[PDB]
Design a protein around this ligand. Sequence first.
Ligand SMILES: *[C@@H]1O[C@H](CO)[C@@H](O[C@@H]2O[C@H](CO)[C@@H](O[C@@H]3O[C@H](CO[C@H]4O[C@H](CO)[C@@H](O)[C@H](O)[C@@H]4O[C@@H]4O[C@H](CO)[C@@H](O)[C@H](O)[C@H]4NC(C)=O)[C@@H](O)[C@H](O[C@H]4O[C@H](CO)[C@@H](O)[C@H](O)[C@@H]4O[C@@H]4O[C@H](CO)[C@@H](O[C@@H]5O[C@H](CO)[C@@H](O)[C@H](O)[C@@H]5O)[C@H](O)[C@H]4NC(C)=O)[C@@H]3O)[C@H](O)[C@H]2NC(C)=O)[C@H](O)[C@H]1NC(C)=O
Ligand SMILES: *[C@@H]1O[C@H](CO)[C@@H](O[C@@H]2O[C@H](CO)[C@@H](O[C@@H]3O[C@H](CO[C@H]4O[C@H](CO)[C@@H](O)[C@H](O)[C@@H]4O[C@@H]4O[C@H](CO)[C@@H](O)[C@H](O)[C@H]4NC(C)=O)[C@@H](O)[C@H](O[C@H]4O[C@H](CO)[C@@H](O)[C@H](O)[C@@H]4O[C@@H]4O[C@H](CO)[C@@H](O[C@H]5O[C@H](CO)[C@@H](O)[C@H](O)[C@@H]5O)[C@H](O)[C@H]4NC(C)=O)[C@@H]3O)[C@H](O)[C@H]2NC(C)=O)[C@H](O)[C@H]1NC(C)=O
Ligand SMILES: *[C@@H]1O[C@H](CO)[C@@H](O[C@@H]2O[C@H](CO)[C@@H](O[C@@H]3O[C@H](CO[C@@H]4O[C@H](CO)[C@@H](O)[C@H](O)[C@@H]4O[C@@H]4O[C@H](CO)[C@@H](O)[C@H](O)[C@H]4NC(C)=O)[C@@H](O)[C@H](O)[C@@H]3O)[C@H](O)[C@H]2NC(C)=O)[C@H](O)[C@H]1NC(C)=O
Ligand SMILES: *[C@@H]1O[C@H](CO)[C@@H](O[C@@H]2O[C@H](CO)[C@@H](O[C@H]3O[C@H](CO[C@H]4O[C@H](CO)[C@@H](O)[C@H](O)[C@@H]4O)[C@@H](O)[C@H](O[C@@H]4O[C@H](CO)[C@@H](O)[C@H](O)[C@@H]4O)[C@@H]3O)[C@H](O)[C@H]2NC(C)=O)[C@H](O)[C@H]1NC(C)=O
Length: 326
Amino acid sequence: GRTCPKPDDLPFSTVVPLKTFYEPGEEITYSCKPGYVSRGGMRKFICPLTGLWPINTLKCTPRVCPFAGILENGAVRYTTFEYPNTISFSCNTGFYLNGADSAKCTEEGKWSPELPVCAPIICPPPSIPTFATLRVYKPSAGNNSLYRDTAVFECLPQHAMFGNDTITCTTHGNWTKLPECREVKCPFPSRPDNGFVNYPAKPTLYYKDKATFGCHDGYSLDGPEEIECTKLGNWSAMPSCKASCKVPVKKATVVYQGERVKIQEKFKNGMLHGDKVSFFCKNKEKKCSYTEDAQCIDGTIEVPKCFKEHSSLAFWKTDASDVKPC
Ligand SMILES: *[C@@H]1O[C@H](CO)[C@@H](O[C@@H]2O[C@H](CO)[C@@H](O[C@@H]3O[C@H](CO[C@H]4O[C@H](CO)[C@@H](O)[C@H](O)[C@@H]4O[C@@H]4O[C@H](CO)[C@@H](O)[C@H](O)[C@H]4NC(C)=O)[C@@H](O)[C@H](O[C@H]4O[C@H](CO)[C@@H](O)[C@H](O)[C@@H]4O[C@@H]4O[C@H](CO)[C@@H](O[C@@H]5O[C@H](CO)[C@@H](O)[C@H](O)[C@@H]5O)[C@H](O)[C@H]4NC(C)=O)[C@@H]3O)[C@H](O)[C@H]2NC(C)=O)[C@H](O)[C@H]1NC(C)=O
Ligand SMILES: *[C@@H]1O[C@H](CO)[C@@H](O[C@@H]2O[C@H](CO)[C@@H](O[C@@H]3O[C@H](CO[C@H]4O[C@H](CO)[C@@H](O)[C@H](O)[C@@H]4O[C@@H]4O[C@H](CO)[C@@H](O)[C@H](O)[C@H]4NC(C)=O)[C@@H](O)[C@H](O[C@H]4O[C@H](CO)[C@@H](O)[C@H](O)[C@@H]4O[C@@H]4O[C@H](CO)[C@@H](O[C@H]5O[C@H](CO)[C@@H](O)[C@H](O)[C@@H]5O)[C@H](O)[C@H]4NC(C)=O)[C@@H]3O)[C@H](O)[C@H]2NC(C)=O)[C@H](O)[C@H]1NC(C)=O
Ligand SMILES: *[C@@H]1O[C@H](CO)[C@@H](O[C@@H]2O[C@H](CO)[C@@H](O[C@@H]3O[C@H](CO[C@@H]4O[C@H](CO)[C@@H](O)[C@H](O)[C@@H]4O[C@@H]4O[C@H](CO)[C@@H](O)[C@H](O)[C@H]4NC(C)=O)[C@@H](O)[C@H](O)[C@@H]3O)[C@H](O)[C@H]2NC(C)=O)[C@H](O)[C@H]1NC(C)=O
Ligand SMILES: *[C@@H]1O[C@H](CO)[C@@H](O[C@@H]2O[C@H](CO)[C@@H](O[C@H]3O[C@H](CO[C@H]4O[C@H](CO)[C@@H](O)[C@H](O)[C@@H]4O)[C@@H](O)[C@H](O[C@@H]4O[C@H](CO)[C@@H](O)[C@H](O)[C@@H]4O)[C@@H]3O)[C@H](O)[C@H]2NC(C)=O)[C@H](O)[C@H]1NC(C)=O
């Protein structure tokens, strides 16, 4: 007699019982696979005497989970919302994901886990360190702060801040490192030889107290006029009063700070300690002029050997300063 052959394999379906041939009268059942549905549901068929399976209209399609394309204050990555697809979640800047960062459309057509929600990152009010005060703080969310809000500490008078005055509200709802404020003391600064020092009239000097230095005529400071008590207990500097130099020649054109000057004119009131200058010398061979340097150090300046004075107009090809350069 005729038999029906092995039934067609339709997409996303199973057939029960599955055999390679059937006697007329035997029943098969097509079902959608878990996670699929079809217009009509299960199709049952009985092998007819002709041995021909009739037409099967079963169309098995994925279950569709509910629309999950919008995360308030964030983003969803998805292709479609159908079984068995995963969707991914993330939050805009300043929000955190309250829930799982992914979810799956299950064979039952619901999301697992449940869809998350985005919420504002918040820090509680910050603690004030000891001997610190709070300059810049205003809450931006009820009484709490929002992500990347800042607070600024300043120390009490006579206290140095170790660390940094500005804290930020982090992603972890806690603030960045607090700074410490300790009291710091400096010794009295030493009066320099050939000068004086002024600092405030009181028995101890603290962080940020200023001392100013002066020199007697004929001396200048070899460092800054004003110094301050630093966070490490020492002073910003300790300058000396150093001796000025007499102009070492009666008349000469020199280079000072990259320009030609008359040394008698530019330094009519002496040369300060530090003042550097270049004297002009003649190369007799190549009939041209070169410079050698000289510096005022604590009342002494060494004019180069090559320099020849009584410079008006005399020596062949005139003053070294007026001769063509080498
Ligand atoms: C706000 O709120 C937040 C929420 O919690 C807080 O955030 C936390 O920050 C703290 C740290 O302050 C975190 O805890 C700590 O985690 C440290 C890092 O762990 C990583 O490395 C571990 C190595 O064993 C490993 O177990 C982890 O897997 C982890 O690794 C990584 O994985 C990520 C991916 O997920 C990768 O991207 C990373 O690249 C990868 N990194 C690594 C290294 O693999 C941890 O070190 C720290 O331990 C200290 O404190 C413990 C206190 O009980 C103590 O038991 C530990 O021993 C340790 O201490 C020190 O010991 C270590 C050695 O174990 C010393 O280090 C070495 O010295 C060797 C010399 O012999 C040298 O050879 C080595 O090279 C090395 O230098 C170290 O010197 C010791 N230090 C001291 C002082 O003794 C701790 O467990 C916490 O997990 C964070 N949580 C969160 C949610 O963020 C935040 O703190 C809050 N903020 C404020 C301001 O309060
Ligand atoms: C910045 O952030 C800070 C910190 O959070 C914040 O400061 C907070 O500010 C709020 C308000 O300014 C303070 O709190 C609450 O104030 C209560 C006083 O008033 C009420 O009455 C007025 C009347 O005009 C009404 O208008 C108010 O709305 C309010 O009453 C309401 O009453 C109706 C009745 O019709 C209810 O329908 C409402 O639910 C109720 N509303 C509210 C909001 O409560 C004060 O009494 C409360 O105190 C509570 O909660 C405290 C939590 O810390 C707790 O310490 C207290 O002890 C007290 O809790 C009491 O708990 C008892 C048990 O432990 C309970 O016992 C009896 O009741 C039940 C019976 O069923 C049983 O438990 C028991 O058998 C017994 O009979 C008490 O009932 C219960 N008391 C109350 C009143 O419920 C609230 O504090 C905050 O205190 C304050 N927080 C801090 C830390 O300062 C600030 O506002 C923020 N800044 C900004 C700008 O936002
Ligand atoms: C205590 O420690 C703190 C933590 O380390 C210190 O804070 C840090 O300060 C430094 C410098 O002050 C910050 O870094 C620098 O950032 C520069 C990048 O700046 C940007 O410029 C881009 C243009 O090319 C913009 O597209 C960016 O938006 C950004 O912005 C602007 O910056 C302007 C000032 O320059 C400002 O006027 C604008 O309003 C602002 N605009 C915007 C949108 O931001 C780099 O060029 C530098 O090389 C360097 O990286 C550093 O970021 C900051 N720490 C953190 C976590 O942000 C703090 O200084 C210290 N306190 C003390 C007293 O030392
Ligand atoms: C006011 O206060 C303090 C004194 O209380 C002064 O601080 C001192 O300043 C010096 C330099 O400014 C610092 O010490 C050393 O710093 C550098 C770099 O140090 C780094 O590199 C070393 C490797 O050499 C390594 O350990 C670390 O990575 C470190 O960060 C060094 O090059 C140098 O180190 C040596 O100093 C020795 C003298 O003590 C010599 O024998 C060595 O040959 C070499 O020069 C340098 O000394 C410190 O910060 C600090 N020192 C101490 C002891 O406290 C501060 O300068 C002063 N200011 C004023 C204005 O008076």
